[PDB]
Design an enzyme around this catalytic site. Structure first.
Site, PDB file in Angstrom:
ATOM      1  N   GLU A  11      -7.310   2.290   4.949  1.00 58.78           N
ATOM      2  CA  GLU A  11      -7.541   2.915   3.637  1.00 58.78           C
ATOM      3  C   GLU A  11      -8.502   4.079   3.687  1.00 58.78           C
ATOM      4  O   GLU A  11      -8.557   4.926   2.766  1.00 58.78           O
ATOM      5  CB  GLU A  11      -8.028   1.900   2.591  1.00 58.78           C
ATOM      6  CG  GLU A  11      -6.962   0.859   2.283  1.00 58.78           C
ATOM      7  CD  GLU A  11      -5.748   1.349   1.496  1.00 58.78           C
ATOM      8  OE1 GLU A  11      -4.794   0.560   1.277  1.00 58.78           O
ATOM      9  OE2 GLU A  11      -5.724   2.538   1.094  1.00 58.78           O
ATOM     10  N   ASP A  20      -4.102   9.096  -3.714  1.00 64.30           N
ATOM     11  CA  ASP A  20      -3.595   8.311  -2.613  1.00 64.30           C
ATOM     12  C   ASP A  20      -2.254   8.853  -2.140  1.00 64.30           C
ATOM     13  O   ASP A  20      -1.766   9.927  -2.570  1.00 64.30           O
ATOM     14  CB  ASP A  20      -3.529   6.844  -3.010  1.00 64.30           C
ATOM     15  CG  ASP A  20      -2.423   6.445  -3.974  1.00 64.30           C
ATOM     16  OD1 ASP A  20      -2.374   5.245  -4.368  1.00 64.30           O
ATOM     17  OD2 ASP A  20      -1.578   7.270  -4.342  1.00 64.30           O
TER      18      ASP A  20
END
Ligand code: CL
Ligand code: CL
Ligand code: K
Ligand code: NA
Length: 162
Positions: A11, A20
């Site tokens: 992540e 994202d």
């Protein structure tokens, strides 16, 4: 290696709101804020989540706090889901981390729809499961991450993260 270290690799860590891989406002260690295209909506979610007026910026300790909550929520989610809990319970500790990783990324409902892959995992048909897992939007959209998670399921080792 453990689930925190694994998801930290997958992540990243960013202290300013960013978009994202799906174009959605996020912060910290993969903390999804909202699917709304409004940055103001994302800022409001952030301030609610942290409990102060952040103006789109948090500290590392704050990031890590959201991360602890989000990992726990993924595990909770699995245990409360009638399709995921039996697979989870059948797995070893390393492969459990692979399942948590998937739920973190795509949510409980989404991973629960991987019905054939989940059956293969329950059956401990590891190579077959790995093949089936790759036949997915998930794999195509995030192939390097999916390859790591799939290798974790195939082998029950941390070789893809070491
Ligand atoms: Cl496909
Ligand atoms: Cl990727
Ligand atoms: K900061
Ligand atoms: Na990310």
């Amino acid at each position: 290696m453990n689930i925190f270290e694994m998801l930290r690799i997958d992540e990243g860590l960013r202290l300013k709101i960013y978009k994202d891989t799906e174009g959605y406002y996020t912060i910290g260690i993969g903390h999804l804020l909202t699917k709304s295209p409004s940055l103001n909506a994302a800022k409001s979610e952030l301030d609610k989540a942290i409990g102060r007026n952040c103006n789109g910026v948090i500290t590392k300790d704050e990031a890590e706090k959201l991360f602890n909550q989000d990992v726990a929520a993924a595990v909770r989610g699995i245990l409360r889901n009638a399709k995921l809990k039996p697979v989870y319970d059948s797995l070893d500790a390393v492969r459990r981390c692979a399942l948590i990783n998937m739920v973190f990324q795509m949510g409980e409902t989404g991973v629960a729809g991987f019905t054939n892959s989940l059956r293969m995992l329950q059956q401990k048909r590891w190579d077959e499961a790995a093949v089936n897992l790759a036949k997915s939007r998930w794999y195509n959209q995030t192939p390097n991450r999916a390859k790591r998670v799939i290798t974790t399921f195939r082998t029950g080792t941390w070789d893809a993260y070491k």
